[model samples]
Target chain A: CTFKISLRNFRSILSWELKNHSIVPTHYTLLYTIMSKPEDLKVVKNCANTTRSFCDLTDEWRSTHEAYVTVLEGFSTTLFSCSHNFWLAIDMSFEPPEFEIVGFTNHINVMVKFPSELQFDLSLVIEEQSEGIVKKHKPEMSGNFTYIIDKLIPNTNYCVSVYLEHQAVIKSPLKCTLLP
Target chain B: SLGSRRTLMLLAQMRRISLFSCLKDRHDFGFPQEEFETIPVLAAMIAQIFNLFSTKDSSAAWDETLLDKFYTELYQQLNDLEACDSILAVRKYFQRITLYLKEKKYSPCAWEVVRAEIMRSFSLSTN
Candidate 1:
C-alpha cells in the first residue's frame, strides 16, 4: 500500500509496507524497466522469488530515469503497485562555512553554526609549530555537538583545519592554546 | 581501481548486519548490485543493512564519508562488472559454494571447503 525509494551511497533501495498488514503476501517479485528506447526490462535476478517487502536494485540504473514495478504474489491474487519513477542523481551535501571551532586550553570544541538533516565527519589537519609536524585525524560529529576534538600538545602553537577530502577547506582562525 | 576484497571486508564493521561485507556489494550480473542477490538465501542477509543505522544503534560507529565513497565506487563497479562479457559466470560459482555451505549447515567444514576450493575455482573463473 505504501512504497518509497531512497538512493544513498549510490545504492538504490526500494521500500514498501502494507497499509493493511492484516493481509499476508505469499512472495514478491520486482520488475524493473527503463522508460527509454527499447524499454529494457529485467526481473531482479535475486528477487524473482522473495518473501520480503522491499528489494534492492540488482541492476544499476545510473543516470537513467526509470519506473520500477513491484509484483506481490499470493494473498488471493497478484498485486502490482503503480510504478515508482526515479532519476538517479548523485546527491551530496558538504560542511557549510558557518561552522564554529571554539578553542580552550589544549582542545577546541568544533561544531556547526547551522543545521541540515545530514551530519558530517570532520577531517582534521593539525599542524604544530610547523617544524612541520602534521597530524591527520578523521573524527565524526555525533550527538554531542558533532563531537569534539581535544588531545593536543599543551601550551603550544598550532593551526587546526577541517576538510572533506578535496572538497572543503574550513580553517580554524589562528589561535594558540595555553595550559594543560 | 577503488577497492579489493580485503578492503571491502574491512568495511564489515559498519554494516555487519549483512556479514561478509563484500558479498552484499556484488550483485547478479543483470542488476546494478552485488553477488548475494542471485542466491535467494544470501540476498536476505543484507536486506536490512540499514536497520541498525536507522535505529541509531550504530551511531558511534558512523563514518559517513568513507562509507559513502564505498557505495559510490560500489555503484561504478557494479556497472563495470556488468560490462564484462562473461562475468555473469560468477553467479553460478557463488551458488555452488553456498549450496556447499548449506550441506554443512554453515558449519566449520562449510567454510573450509570454500576456503580450500576458492583458490582453484576463482582462478579458472578469472581465467
Candidate 2:
C-alpha cells in the first residue's frame, strides 16, 4: 500500500527569471509512484534515491510489479526558485467525467449531468478562472440551465471553458471559439 | 432556421481545427497538439455542410419547449457516440454548442431560415 516517487527533467531546463533573480524555465517535472501491497516500498525507495537513474528504474518498474506510475510534465509561467517545493496529490478512484458542449450566439456552454444520488456542489466547478470578464450561472431545476456570455471579440479564437470543482476535480471537452 | 445554429457550431469547430493545423507547419503552438493534426478533416466536412444548408429557404418556428427537447436529444446523441478522440471531440463540441443555442430561446435570422429549409422540411416518424 505505500510507495515512493521522485521526479526529474528529461529535457533541458528552460531559461526564465524568478522573482529572486534566478533563471529557470517555465516547465518542470513531477513523478508519482504507487504500489498495491505493503512490501513494494523497497523498490519504490530505490527508484527515488538514485538521482539520475530514472530510465533504468522505469524499465525495472514496468517489468516487476504493476506500479501505477504517473509522470506529470508540468510547465508554469511562474518561477519557483526557493527550495523547489511542490505538492503531490493523488486520487485513485477517479471517474472520467464528460461534458456536452452547448453553443449560443456569444459563447459555448458545457453541461455536466451527474447522477441524482451524487450530492455534489457545482458552483465552484462552473465558474471561470481565467483573467477576463467571465461568469457562472447556477443550474436551474436539477439537470439543465445556460451559461450566458457576452463581449466576445470578433474574429478571434477563445480557449474552451475550464470548470474546476474543488482543488482536485476537473472536467473537459476543452472547447475553443471560432472566428467568423 | 431549422438547424442553422447547430450547423454553424459544427462548421466552426471544424474550421478552427483546420486553421490550427495549417499554422502549425510554420509556427507550431503548444497545449493543443491534437488540433494541429486533426482539425482540417472536420473543417472540410463543415464546409460541405455549410454549402448544403446555405442553399435552403424556409424557417420553421421554434419555441422553448422544442429547444429543450433539441438539447436533450443532441446531448444524448453525443453521449452515445462518446467523442473521446481529437476529431470526434471537436465535432461533438460543436454539436453541444448548437443544442445550447437552440435552448437559449432566441430567434434565427432570415438568412438562417432560408438555409435551414433542409432540416425544417423533414418530419420524424412517431411510432
Candidate 3:
C-alpha cells in the first residue's frame, strides 16, 4: 500500500533532495519523473499534445531570457563609453583690465547620448597674488561656465581652478600681466 | 619725436608710481578723507593724458615740468597725511577711477579743457 501525492508535492520533494545532494534540478527532469506511469504518456500525448507544447514554451522562455540579457549588456556598454570620454576644457581671457574665466564640458554630447541623463555642478576658485587670497565663487549648473574677476591689481599674478561634480578638479596655468 | 615719446613715458611712469601708490597707501594716512578726495583729480589727469595721445596733433609735446607740477598738486592735496606706514596697504586704485570715468562720456575737447583748468589751478596755487 503506497501513498499517493500530487505532482506539485512530488516536485518539491525532488527539489529538496537535489539541493541536499548538491545536484542541479531542471524542469525537463522534473517532467520526465512525473511521466513514469506507462499510461500517463499516452494520455498526455493524445489529449494535451504535451511534448510539442513543452518544447515551444521552453524555446519562448529561452528567447525572452536572451533578449533581457542583451539589453542589460547594451546598457552597461553605453555607461562605460560615457564615463571614459568625460573631459573638460578651461580657458582664460582678459576683458580689458579684468580677467574672465571660461570652462567647457568636452564630453557633454556623449553624456547626453546615454538613456540616463548626467549632470554636473561647476565652480571656480581664483587665487590672487597681491594679498595671497583664495576666493571661491558660487557653484553653477552643468555645461559651460564663466566668471569675471574684476578690480585686479596691476603687475599681479593670478591662478584659476575649476571644481566639477563627482570630485573632478582642474587647475589652469598661472596668468601674469601688468595693467596697461 | 623722441622727446614726445620720452615725455609720454615719464608721464605714464609718474602716474603709475604716484597716483596708484597714493591710493594704495590711503589707509596709512590719519586723515583718509583728504587723500580720498584727490582721487577725482588724479583720475582726470590720467584721462587728460589719454585724450592728449589721441589728438590729431599728437606732435604737440608733453612737458616734464607739467608732470612735476601735477605731482606737486597731488602731494599738496594729501599734505595733511603723514608718511605711509605699511607697504601692503598699496593696491590698485585705477579701477575706481575707470568706473568714475565710465559714468560720463568726456569728449577729447572736454578733457583738454579739464587739463587746462587743472594746470591753471596748479599755477595759481603755487603763486
Candidate 4:
C-alpha cells in the first residue's frame, strides 16, 4: 500500500510537532517515521511530486528554523550588551583659588578591564540643573581625564557622567561640588 | 471640589487608555509598542534627551541630579512592569526592536547609546 501526503497536511504535522514536541525532525527522519513498508518507500521514491513536496517542506523547515534562531540570538546579544558593567568614578575640586564665579575642575577616572587591543573613546557631560545648560567634554585619552569648566555661577547643582563609546554610560551618583 | 477631583481622575484614566491604543496602532505599523508600554514615561524622557542633543552647543550635557532623577524614574517604571528580571524584559524588548529595525530602514544616531540604556534599564537586575 502507498501513502500520499499533501503540502497542507505536511505543514500541519510540522506545526504540531513544533508545538507539542518542541522539536522538528528532518525530512528524512519524518519520512522514516511515517513510512513502515518497503513498498511505501518505493512508491514515494518513484513519485516526482512527492519527492518535490518533501524537498519543499525541508526547505521551508530549515528557513523557519533559521529565522527563529536568528531572532533568539539577536535578543540574547542585546541582553548581553545591556547587562554588562564598568567602573566609573568622579571627583571635583574648586580650582585656581578663585572666589565665586569660577568654574571648577572635574576629575573623571574610569577603570574598566577591556581587551587591550580594543580602544574606546571616553567623554564627560556636565549639566547645570536650574538653567538646563549642558556641557560635553572629551578626554584627551582613555583612563583618567580632567577638564576645567569655567565662567559658571556658584551654588548650582551639576550632573556628570562618563560615556564610554560602544559600551555603557556611567553617571555619577551625586551632584558636583558648588563652585567657591 | 470632590466632583471635580473624580472627573479629573476619570479623565486621566481615559487618557492612559487612549495613549495605549495609539501605541498599539503604532506597533501595528511595525513600531516597538511593547517596549514603549514597558516604560510609559520613556517617550517623554526621550523627547527631553533629544531636545538637549539638538542644541548647538557641542558640550551640552545633563546634570547628574537630573540623570539620577531619570534613572530613578526608569527604575520605578520598570518596577511597575514587573521587570525584576530585567534581562528577560530587555531580551523581549530588543526582539521587538530587532523586528522593527528589520522591517524599516533607519540610521543610527548620537542618541543610540541613550536609547540602548533606556532599553537596558528594563532588564537591569535590581538585586
Task: Give the least accurate 10-residue stretch of model 2 chain A, judged by summed lDDT.
Answer: A7-16
Docking class of 2: incorrect
List candidate 3 stretches off by more than 4 Å.
A1-117, A122-131, A139-144, A165-168, B1-127
CAPRI class of candidate 1: incorrect
Give the number of the best model, judged by TM-score. 1
- Identify the superior model by DockQ, candidate 3 or candidate 4: 4
- Candidate 2, residues B31-92, lDDT tens digits: the string is 12244333243343234333333322211333334434444444443443345365555455
| Candidate 2 lDDT by residue in tens digits, A66-121 | 22333323333542311111112111112323445544556656655443322122
DockQ of 3: 0.00
Number of the candidate with higher TM-score, 1 or 2? 1
Per-residue lDDT of candidate 4, residues A1-180 (tens digit)? 111222221121121111122133212222211100111211123222221212223232221101010000011112210011111111111011101122354332223222211111223343333356666655443333345555555567554433332122434343445554
Steric collisions counted per model: 13, 11, 0, 8
Q: Give candidate 2 regions above 4 Å deviation.
A: A1-96, A120-124, A127-145, A162-164, A171-173, B1-127
What would the per-residue lDDT of candidate 3 be over residues B13-88, giving only the tens digit for each residue? Answer: 3321212111211111111122334434433433443444334433233345655554444444444222212111
Q: Best lDDT goes to which candidate?
A: 1
Please report, as a value between 0 and 1, the fraction of native contacts recovered by candidate 4. Answer: 0.00
Residue B35 lDDT, candidate 3, scale 0-100: 30
Q: How accurate locally is residue A26 in candidate 2, as Cα lDDT from 0 to 100?
A: 37
Worst 10-residue lDDT window for candidate 1 chain B reads B18-27
